């Protein structure tokens, strides 16, 4: 079977070596003859003439394309080629990576990225992960937003936990008075997390408005998809420090691996068809000779394109033509203005580079630690720690997430990250009361050695050791008042009394 690989960029023969020179392409009656054609151009005339020559003269039925340009219309140019050739097409990189519209019933063009509902679900999973149920939505008049917000809603009420959607925004940049109208609801901006929907040119204006109002303060975390942020290398000056985006795996998942997986899926689909019907659908005779009654010849091909299993992984696409298990990467731009991958999503598993929420402290003065570091030792009923309900993601509202410490003597070379568990207590009640009164917060974690503290040859350990070494700023626990601790820490006003007491049987 004739396969054409369109090269636009710096890709070389190493991709060819990694793609087809490593896997077995047997079990096919006809050997897959692959030809690579390279061009820097996306101008329609040259590419359509080249593909017409490859289709009529050479009878090529497989299309593989990747590039490194932000041009998004070529993704659906590929869809037109699919409509005009009835041959499978796969989008991989660059201009063939982002989302596509006009899902055509007669076209079988597939894309390796995430489908709109897929990044919607990933974003709401991230939203649940950072368990801050207050958020807003800023969305421009770019079409396709209605279905996006529709599915966001559908899922947000599908999970019947107590969400809090502040507002949904429709932006009109075609009118200068549109921004002035927008200012009224911008006055209603109080949620620290806002979900953005726009293009890149609209994005620049959006960031300009955001940093003109002053939405770059602490706690203001922004999550945008790949379309909004464009390319990672191109960093507009409007990008605020600590800006987080979600895209596809561009670093760990290299392009040769992508094309190898794609060609393996193509071979599997061809073998499945050959087992299904045992005939080779001949391509069109000419580009001007469109096949109308032969659609059924290729539609059966499509019947195997959605469901393909490769290397024991469910790399199969979905109904709209998007891989149901995509390797998604959440990247963060820090004060250094460099993009660092801080989250991964693959094989229905979500992993955070930081178990504790990363400190996206902005470039603001003061930088007072409103989130005081708090350590506590398990002592019921002051402390009641329980496992977080996996079905609900959290526990009931009065519980607070607290961290089991990083200790494992089995393998000290690897640090076993803190473990989030839902914990409650009278002390925690005092803490939330004082946090709501003083308008500050706190992080909860567990003492390393499971002890209140003792002066081991002058050096303090336990909670007292953490406080002495400034690891724990403020202390929380049922610890009495001692003179040795008084010389190293400051004892606050006690909230309950105790002492040398004697208990006897009631009898």
């Amino acid at each position, epitope marked *: 079977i004739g396969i054409a690989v369109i090269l636009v960029g710096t890709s070389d023969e190493v991709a*060819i*070596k990694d793609a*087809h*020179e*490593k*896997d*077995d*392409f*047997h079990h096919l*009656s*006809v*050997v*897959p*003859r*692959v030809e690579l054609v390279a061009m820097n151009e996306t101008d329609p005339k040259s590419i359509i003439t080249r593909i017409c020559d490859l289709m009529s003269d*050479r*009878k090529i039925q497989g299309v593989v394309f990747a590039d490194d340009t932000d041009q998004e219309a070529i993704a659906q140019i590929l869809d037109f080629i699919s409509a005009q050739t009835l041959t499978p097409i796969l989008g991989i990189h660059g201009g063939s990576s982002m989302i596509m519209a006009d899902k055509d019933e007669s076209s079988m063009f597939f894309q390796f990225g995430p489908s709109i509902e897929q990044q919607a679900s990933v974003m709401l999973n991230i939203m649940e992960e950072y368990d801050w149920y207050i958020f807003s939505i800023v969305t421009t008049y770019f079409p396709g937003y209605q279905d996006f917000v529709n599915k966001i809603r559908s899922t947000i009420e599908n999970s019947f936990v107590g969400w809090e959607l502040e507002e949904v925004l429709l932006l009109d940049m075609s009118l200068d008075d549109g921004d002035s109208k927008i200012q009224n609801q911008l006055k209603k901006l109080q949620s620290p997390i806002i979900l953005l929907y726009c293009t890149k040119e609209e994005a620049t204006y959006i960031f300009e408005v955001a940093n003109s109002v002053g939405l770059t303060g602490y706690g203001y975390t922004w999550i945008v998809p790949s379309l909004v942020a464009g390319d990672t290398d191109t960093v507009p000056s409007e990008f605020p420090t600590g800006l987080i985006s979600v895209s596809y795996d561009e670093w760990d998942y290299g392009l040769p691996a992508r094309v190898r997986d794609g060609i393996a899926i193509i071979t599997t689909a061809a073998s499945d068809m050959l087992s299904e019907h045992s005939f080779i659908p001949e391509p069109k005779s000419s580009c001007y000779n469109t096949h109308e009654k032969r659609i059924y010849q290729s539609n059966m091909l499509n019947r195997y394109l959605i469901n393909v299993t490769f290397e024991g992984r469910n790399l199969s696409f979905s109904e709209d033509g998007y891989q149901m298990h995509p390797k998604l990467v959440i990247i963060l731009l820090n004060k250094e203005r460099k993009w660092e991958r801080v989250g991964k999503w693959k094989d229905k598993s979500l992993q955070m580079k930081y178990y504790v929420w990363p400190r996206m402290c902005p470039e603001t003065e003061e930088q007072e630690d409103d989130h005081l570091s708090i350590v506590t030792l398990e002592e019921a009923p002051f402390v009641i720690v329980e496992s977080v309900d996996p079905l609900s993601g959290t526990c009931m509202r009065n519980t607070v997430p607290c961290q089991k410490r990083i200790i494992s003597e089995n393998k000290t070379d690897e640090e076993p990250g803190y473990i989030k568990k839902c914990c409650k207590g009278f002390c925690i009640d005092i803490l939330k009361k004082i946090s709501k009164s003083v308008k500050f917060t706190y992080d909860l974690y567990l003492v390393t050695n499971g002890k209140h503290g003792k002066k081991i040859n002058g050096t303090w350990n336990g909670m007292i050791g953490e406080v002495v070494m400034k690891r724990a700023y403020m202390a929380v626990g049922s610890l009495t008042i001692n003179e040795e601790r008084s010389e190293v820490v400051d004892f606050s006003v006690p909230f309950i009394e105790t002492g040398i007491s004697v208990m006897v049987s009631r009898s």
Partner: antibody
Amino acid sequence: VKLQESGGGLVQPGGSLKLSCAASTFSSYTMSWVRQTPEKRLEWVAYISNGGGGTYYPDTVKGRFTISRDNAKNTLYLQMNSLKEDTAMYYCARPSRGGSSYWYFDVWGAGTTVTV
Amino acid sequence: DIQMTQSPSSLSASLGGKVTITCKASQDINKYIAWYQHKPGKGPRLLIHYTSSLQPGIPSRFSGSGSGRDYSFSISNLEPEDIATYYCLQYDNLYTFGGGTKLEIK
């Protein structure tokens, strides 16, 4: 990379003799060989893909030849059993572009004789 | 496995003469023609790709006609230094060889 044949000979009547052609990376490049008829006719013997699979034979030596490959030494392993009436001369060849498919090849070996 | 046969496996020529070999394929190759040769101890060499495909270090006197199932390969005024035998080989199902054709000089 250059191909050099070794293990040519069919002295034992009715036996099974091992021919090979080593290469001097060749790990990702497929390999083929051609037998010479007494009428000088060039004939295919066995087929191996780049990954070692797809071990098929033409309609002349089907079901009687054993073939294998090893990329560690860049060698092929072919057993001759039914070439008694042939003073054959096989030569190895490496198709270009590697892969499991087949193309047109130019890098050719040295030539080893097989005599009874 | 797709098969192929060659004809007439014989030629009658000398230092001068246009010799034509007819390739009779079985499956529609759509230009998958290949022409090879070999020497009894000089070392074979690649001659002809698709129709009249020129190659470096290769004379262009060779000509080709026809397509698909029927091909005709012609050599005009061959030299007495490249006296060898030619072969029409294709590739549809793995490899597809045939009987081949001869070439003898009086």
